Design a binder for this molecule. Structure first.
Ligand SMILES: CCN1C(=O)CC(=O)N(CC)C1=S
Ligand SMILES: CCN1C(=O)CC(=O)N(CC)C1=S
Length: 358
């Protein structure tokens, strides 16, 4: 790799790992469309297993970008419309507050205050129905963005209903496989378990627990190589042969809502490039990222803007991940770690690295 890339990455990531006490980390830098890989530390401390390019990390919320793209693919297939009412795909949802709440609203956290987490008490499908039936919005639909697994999670579930496929099957066959993401999983098969890093929370080794709509909201695990390929795909959607997937990716980066200087896509979030680093750094802090904020409707949505900082932070109990890229520049980065460390530290490192290379 170019010594510039090596120095920039190492000078940035080494202190980050030290300061944040990150056990293991993998980084991919996409420079002029080509990936460059870097690994540090341990995937499994007790077994002294190092991080490698084949190490599986929990993506957490970065999963929502796959979910967004899968939804976009379903739109392109004509199987769903984002303008349709939610009740069209879930007739049992008869409570009156669901009037006027569309798939768009679910996909973009603008339904009116759906909670961050689906309650752990929800186990069966009937529990799930009861939950959404009894949910009372704090706001009118399409007025406030509140980041929520219960929102985009339900979107994912409904988006694949007409296809007849389970969410996992739709994702595998319509997204993972055509993009040759051969080491990306919703459920890690035993054959791949040896590469599945442990997460670390408070010194304890942890993996993500099963939960309602987990697959749809935070259930993807991937390697640094597949995630680099994921970024390449989202950098250059036109190079992709499957028409609907190609279109789906474009739709996922459309700008549907604005709050502050940020735009909400399907899973992906975007800002105009060049960005104010303080804005994306401070904005990633949960006190802002998880806050209720008013939205300006983008009518109609702006098609994917090449001059954008496109990104997503992700977390599970034991993992912290970040993906960012700039389509106009053929420039991107993936940061995968088996510790959930503060978002602003992730974004700061990413902007430091990409800015030096642009
Ligand atoms: C649905 C119309 N539309 C958009 O709003 C944005 C976009 O990028 N594209 C192209 C795939 C379309 S068709
Ligand atoms: C349910 C997954 N998960 C976590 O475990 C921890 C966390 O901070 N976040 C982000 C809100 C998520 S989605």
């Amino acid at each position: 790799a170019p010594q510039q890339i090596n120095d920039i990455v190492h000078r940035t990531i080494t202190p980050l790992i030290e300061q944040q006490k990150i056990p293991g980390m993998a980084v991919a830098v996409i420079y002029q469309g080509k990936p460059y890989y870097f690994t540090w530390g341990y995937a499994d401390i007790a077994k002294k297993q190092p991080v490698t390019q084949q190490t599986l990390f929990e993506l957490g919320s970065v999963s929502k970008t796959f979910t967004g793209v899968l939804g976009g693919d379903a739109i392109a297939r004509g199987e769903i419309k984002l303008s349709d009412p939610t009740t069209k795909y879930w007739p049992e949802l008869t409570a009156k507050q669901w009037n006027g709440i569309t798939l768009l609203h679910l996909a973009t956290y603008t339904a009116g205050g759906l909670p961050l987490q689906v309650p752990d008490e929800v186990k069966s499908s009937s529990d799930l129905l009861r939950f959404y039936q009894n949910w009372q919005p704090a706001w009118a639909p399409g007025t406030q963005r509140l980041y929520a697994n219960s929102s985009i999670g339900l979107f994912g579930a409904l988006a694949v209903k007409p296809s007849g496929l389970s969410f996992e099957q739709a994702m595998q066959t319509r997204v993972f496989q055509p993009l040759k993401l051969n080491h990306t999983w919703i459920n890690v098969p035993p054959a791949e378990e040896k590469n599945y890093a442990w997460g670390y929370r408070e010194g304890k080794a942890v993996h993500v627990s099963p939960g309602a709509l987990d697959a749809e909201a935070y259930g993807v695990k991937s390697t640094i190589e597949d995630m680099a390929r994921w970024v390449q795909s989202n950098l250059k959607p036109l190079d992709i042969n499957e028409k609907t997937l190609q279109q789906g990716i474009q739709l996922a980066q459309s700008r549907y809502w604005q709050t502050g200087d940020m735009y909400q896509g399907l899973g992906w979030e975007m800002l105009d490039w060049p960005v104010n680093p303080d804005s994306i750094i401070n904005g990633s802090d949960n006190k802002i990222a998880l806050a209720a904020r008013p939205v300006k409707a983008i009518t109609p949505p702006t098609p994917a803007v090449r001059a954008s900082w496109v990104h997503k932070t992700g977390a599970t109990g034991g993992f912290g991940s970040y993906v960012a890229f700039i389509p106009e520049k053929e420039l991107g980065i993936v940061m995968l770690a088996n510790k959930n460390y503060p978002n602003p530290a992730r974004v700061d490192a990413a902007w430091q690295i990409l800015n030096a290379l642009q």
